[PDB]
Amino acid sequence: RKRRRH
Amino acid sequence: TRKRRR
């Protein structure tokens, strides 16, 4: 899976 | 075998 940095 | 993998 993937993670976006907010 | 009766074993069942996912």
Next chain:
Amino acid sequence: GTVNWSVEDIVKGINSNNLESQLQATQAARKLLSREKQPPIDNIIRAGLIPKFVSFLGKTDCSPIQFESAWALTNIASGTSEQTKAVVDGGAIPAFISLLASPHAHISEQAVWALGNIAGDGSAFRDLVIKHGAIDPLLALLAVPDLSTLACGYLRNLTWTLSNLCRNKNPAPPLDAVEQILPTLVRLLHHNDPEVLADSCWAISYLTDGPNERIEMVVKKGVVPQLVKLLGATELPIVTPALRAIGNIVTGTDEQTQKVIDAGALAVFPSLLTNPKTNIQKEATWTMSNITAGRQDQIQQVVNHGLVPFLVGVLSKADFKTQKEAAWAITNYTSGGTVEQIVYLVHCGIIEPLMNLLSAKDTKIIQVILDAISNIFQAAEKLGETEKLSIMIEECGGLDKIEALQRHENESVYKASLNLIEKYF
């Protein structure tokens, strides 16, 4: 300042030969790509900005632009497979691997994050990241006497990226890579942070999802007791991957299943088989079904832990998929169990719920239940108590269900019901 820029302005700034204007435009791009709703990733890609960000990754003399471009590329790589592919095609993998050794902790963290996204895309990019040599610097980042000295978020990102390097099959990760990573994974499995533990358990569950040789690679490291301990944890994000890994392990040889049993796993299943989370119950019942497919002493250890009543309870009332896993567990039990174990199973009240489940529309559960009934009848014949079992099945309304199944579309169910009725009813 650098808030709410247009892609036009970002391009104008990045195309200037002014490194400070480029830095401000790159930060504006980062902020645009970090917005909660609808990040314009495709617009940024069409503008041709990925090569410029990748080139900025290499400006050792300007760490701020390195960080901003790494963040922007991380956010681009977090999207669809096409956008991650665009990032990779820009040459970002070796640049991020080089940044892994940056003296600035936040830049190294961002490189870890970006590599994690890229590897998480799939098997191809996972193995490509491995071929570029990321595992060695990644693990060197964790080469400390005590993991508690590292920043929490940093350690969490490292663990998550390592989990993505263990993820995905067809093909599974390279065996040499798995062996290179497993020691650090064990150490992280003994860490105290809940998120680190969850991601380590997920990594172990990925690694144990395969042939017996992969499971053996994992269990040789001696992680099963720690996996059981975590199976007893209170945080569901930890129990879920730990239970996943334990089930995967019990899908292997009888010796690996026995390693799971010797660690005390069965004592946790009273709670897992009654857990409020439906997924936990389903996974636990599937794990039980694979454990009842083992040797007779392992079925006996299932009996001694008082888990047969819990299987009866799950069969009587639970989500349908959990009930199907319980039916599989009962059928494996009856196929491999002794006559004493089968009559004990009957004494616990399996007949009535096993029969009530014959009203299901799923044909496979009907086949499983009919096989279990035939095995129980064979045991009864070995004891000469077949008439008692027949009247027991008749009293709960089972004979009617079996007779109705005689007129079933599937041929196997047809034949099984006919045989049961003609041989015992």
